Scaffold this active site. Structure first.
Site, mmCIF file in Angstrom:
data_model
loop_
_atom_site.group_PDB
_atom_site.id
_atom_site.type_symbol
_atom_site.label_atom_id
_atom_site.label_comp_id
_atom_site.label_asym_id
_atom_site.label_seq_id
_atom_site.Cartn_x
_atom_site.Cartn_y
_atom_site.Cartn_z
ATOM 1 N N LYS A 1 -12.474 -0.677 7.436
ATOM 2 C CA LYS A 1 -11.754 -1.726 8.204
ATOM 3 C C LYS A 1 -12.064 -1.626 9.682
ATOM 4 O O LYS A 1 -12.405 -2.617 10.346
ATOM 5 C CB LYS A 1 -10.271 -1.629 7.826
ATOM 6 C CG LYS A 1 -10.136 -2.035 6.365
ATOM 7 C CD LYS A 1 -8.794 -1.750 5.738
ATOM 8 C CE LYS A 1 -8.811 -2.321 4.328
ATOM 9 N NZ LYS A 1 -7.867 -1.669 3.401
ATOM 10 N N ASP B 1 -1.417 7.029 5.992
ATOM 11 C CA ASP B 1 -2.473 6.122 5.554
ATOM 12 C C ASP B 1 -2.723 5.142 6.708
ATOM 13 O O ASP B 1 -1.959 4.196 6.899
ATOM 14 C CB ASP B 1 -2.083 5.410 4.279
ATOM 15 C CG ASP B 1 -3.083 4.369 3.815
ATOM 16 O OD1 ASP B 1 -4.151 4.223 4.457
ATOM 17 O OD2 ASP B 1 -2.792 3.693 2.799
ATOM 18 N N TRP C 1 0.830 -1.205 0.000
ATOM 19 C CA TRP C 1 0.000 0.000 0.000
ATOM 20 C C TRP C 1 0.865 1.257 0.000
ATOM 21 O O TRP C 1 0.476 2.283 -0.564
ATOM 22 C CB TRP C 1 -0.982 0.047 1.175
ATOM 23 C CG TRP C 1 -2.093 -0.940 0.973
ATOM 24 C CD1 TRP C 1 -2.324 -2.062 1.720
ATOM 25 C CD2 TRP C 1 -3.114 -0.908 -0.025
ATOM 26 N NE1 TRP C 1 -3.430 -2.730 1.250
ATOM 27 C CE2 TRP C 1 -3.928 -2.031 0.173
ATOM 28 C CE3 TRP C 1 -3.396 -0.010 -1.063
ATOM 29 C CZ2 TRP C 1 -5.032 -2.307 -0.634
ATOM 30 C CZ3 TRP C 1 -4.488 -0.282 -1.865
ATOM 31 C CH2 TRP C 1 -5.284 -1.411 -1.645
HETATM 32 C C1 PLP Z 1 -7.527 -1.180 2.106
HETATM 33 C C2 PLP Z 1 -6.363 -0.159 2.124
HETATM 34 C C3 PLP Z 1 -6.313 0.803 1.138
HETATM 35 C C4 PLP Z 1 -7.345 0.799 0.004
HETATM 36 O O1 PLP Z 1 -8.562 1.422 0.344
HETATM 37 P P1 PLP Z 1 -9.747 1.713 -0.717
HETATM 38 O O2 PLP Z 1 -10.808 2.307 0.110
HETATM 39 O O3 PLP Z 1 -10.036 0.376 -1.259
HETATM 40 O O4 PLP Z 1 -9.099 2.651 -1.661
HETATM 41 C C5 PLP Z 1 -5.301 1.725 1.144
HETATM 42 N N1 PLP Z 1 -4.333 1.688 2.119
HETATM 43 C C6 PLP Z 1 -4.386 0.729 3.095
HETATM 44 C C7 PLP Z 1 -3.334 0.774 4.206
HETATM 45 C C8 PLP Z 1 -5.387 -0.206 3.100
HETATM 46 O O5 PLP Z 1 -5.371 -1.232 4.032
HETATM 47 CL CL CL Z 2 0.813 -3.556 2.779
HETATM 48 CL CL CL Z 3 -5.287 -5.415 1.746
#
Ligand code: PLP
Ligand code: CL
Ligand code: CL
Ligand code: PLP
Ligand code: CL
Ligand code: CL
Ligand code: MG
Ligand code: MG
Ligand code: MG
Ligand code: MG
Lengths: 360, 356
Positions: free
Chosen positions: B195, B171, B101
């Site tokens: 999440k 993030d 990510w």
């Molecule tokens: C799931 C995730 C994303 C992606 O999120 P979307 O809402 O699908 O764009 C980005 N960064 C991290 C750390 C994630 O776990």
């Molecule tokens: Cl990751």
């Molecule tokens: Cl993931």
């Protein structure tokens, strides 16, 4: 309890069975013992929903096989910039037909990105009508021609759509998509936030001619390329799963009542109840739109002065009516009568309108 | 009818939040309409909208000079919106790479401007968080970006670096509000809700106001949303409603410190199981970098891996397959995953080991 009549303009009334269905399975969807909100979008249970929403749309509007249906986040407002970002290339022109405030917002975003033109406009006369297609100023280097099928704030609506062969015709159909039959192949792309006539907020339906836009545009952020979403079937990143689910449920309901052709019949009938009330009021109520352009989705009107406007709206709210205040930018009244608004709400509003008039 | 929801995104939600949603789905707040049927400019919606912000402010103790935004497009759109707003000419988008990510965020920045890698554990397949003393920073950094919890690799920042030359940006999609935070360490924090906070469809953005613009599309300027309190266009109203509900549940159980206690017990159950397995289960992360949110591990070979995941599925466990990019297994134990599910996982892991 007391009566509630839901004339909200966006988000708006949903058909009860779509909500009752969601409620019943909210904790245990498709026997998984999970909410659809708790599923992976890679799960077969979710993919079924995602695919079904697409297939219902395809069948209901008879979308051709060379078109793809996208489910995107960001609202119609994001489409205002995504469209010129993908198609407004150098040396080309974003040509707009202005028939209300939402058309102006679309235009403004293209102006940030490229050359724009105004093909025709009724702005001078306060957007009371749709201009004649013969007045459309077209350009050989147009990237597209953009229209707003239903002008949500002003209460006007295209009765039919122009034949355009020099550029793709693009339409913001947020407030009247799937309120009637549509010849989808007149267009290169159609988009609509779902929250006015297709379900909940949070997803935007984009019907696109695949070959106009399934190609990479150099320098455009991955999420802002149509190509990204076409290639990944709107699963590039996590979709708004509950919104798409509710959209599915609403589409099932439209199909169940006989589809676009049947819902148009219902929509014409509800609209007639309100416009006849206006038209028999001897000027007590004055519709904004010219008669040839009256929207079937948003009925805009004024009383003879602002004091009466306010008293009318205060009385409505006291009697259970929700959402009748006109958009903040224009005042007056606005009865939003999208697909799921029931006809007895319209009858109720007529009763309100006649007694207010008689007692004024 | 036993089901254990280890989905990695979207994910389990608190039963009380879903039950509350169910109960009032047709008649929200005595309005006789669904929350889904309300105008976003209604007071009815506006109170929910503000309540969601207020609960986050309370629960994370977000200072007054931060604004809380609710945006659409996921964390993925933030990957481009951030440099779009802050990666000005002659500045650098500086990234700490601690997983895939991280990589995806850095890729979007490279479209828009100069980038840099302050540090990276990629060479070692992201088994750990790099030592902050290793960071390579630049006077002209526009920001330093990190990924607090590396969802696919199962590693997580234990603490955060003290950065004063440029805003620290994080993030936090897979660990936001799983533990107390010092929000003042950051110029911006962002997370898809799906999440730890709610269903998919809304992205939470916590931004230092004065931190964040000619030529950027209106919808892609943070200022648009700050100025309009995330009501510039129609927000994802049901997702924000559900976010409120989840936040009420977190508040009700005792807040960020209380949920951290639960989360640490959940992770302890699985990691102890792995560590006590004498090499039958092997965790991917170095101990010191172990995530409390996504526990990644493998069996001794691919066939046992597969046998385990098959057995898991038959026994009602959902989502344990590792990310396709790395394989193995991943147990996502976000806030709403109950301790009883992790205990069930342990017991399955122990029985599987015995029966092999
Ligand atoms: C799931 C995730 C994303 C992606 O999120 P979307 O809402 O699908 O764009 C980005 N960064 C991290 C750390 C994630 O776990
Ligand atoms: Cl990751
Ligand atoms: Cl993931
Ligand atoms: C409501 C409306 C929009 C705005 O949609 P968002 O989802 O709020 O961005 C755009 N176009 C029309 C015609 C609308 O009625
Ligand atoms: Cl309009
Ligand atoms: Cl509107
Ligand atoms: Mg049916
Ligand atoms: Mg009735
Ligand atoms: Mg409480
Ligand atoms: Mg021990």
């Amino acid at each position: 309890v007391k009566q509630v009549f839901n004339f909200n303009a966006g988000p708006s009334a949903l058909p009860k069975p779509a909500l009752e269905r969601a409620q019943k399975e909210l904790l245990n969807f498709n026997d998984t013992q999970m909410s659809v909100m708790e599923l992976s979008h890679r799960s077969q249970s979710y993919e079924e929903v995602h695919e079904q929403a697409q297939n219902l749309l395809r069948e209901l509007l008879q979308i051709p096989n060379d078109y793809q249906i996208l489910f995107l986040q960001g609202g119609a407002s994001l489409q205002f910039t995504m469209l010129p970002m993908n198609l407004l290339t150098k040396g080309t022109i974003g040509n707009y037909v202005l028939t209300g405030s939402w058309s102006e917002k679309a235009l403004k975003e293209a102006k940030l990105l490229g050359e724009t033109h105004i093909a025709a406009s009724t702005k001078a006369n306060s957007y009371q009508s749709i201009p004649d297609f013969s007045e459309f100023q077209l350009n050989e280097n147009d990237a597209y021609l953009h229209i707003t099928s239903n002008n949500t704030i002003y209460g006007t609506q295209y009765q039919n759509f122009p034949e355009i062969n020099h550029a793709p015709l693009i339409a913001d159909m947020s407030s009247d998509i799937l309120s009637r039959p549509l010849k989808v192949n007149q267009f290169g792309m159609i988009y609509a936030g779902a929250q006015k006539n297709l379900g909940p907020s949070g997803v935007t339906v984009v019907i696109v001619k695949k070959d106009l836009l399934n190609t990479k545009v150099e320098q455009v952020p991955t999420m802002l390329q149509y190509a990204t979403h076409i290639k990944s079937d709107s699963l590039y990143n996590t979709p708004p799963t509950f919104s798409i689910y509710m959209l599915r449920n609403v589409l099932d309901w439209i199909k169940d009542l006989g589809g676009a052709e049947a819902i148009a019949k219902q929509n014409e009938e509800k609209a007639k109840i309100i416009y006849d009330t206006i038209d028999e009021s001897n000027g007590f109520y004055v519709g904004h739109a010219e008669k040839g352009s009256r929207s079937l989705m948003n009925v805009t009107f004024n009383l003879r002065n602002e004091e009466l406007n306010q008293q009318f709206l205060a009385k409505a709210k006291e009697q259970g009516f929700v959402g009748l205040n006109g958009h903040r930018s224009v005042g007056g009244c606005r009865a939003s009568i999208y697909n799921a608004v029931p006809i007895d709400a319209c009858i109720a509003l007529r009763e309100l309108m006649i007694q207010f008039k008689e007692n004024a």
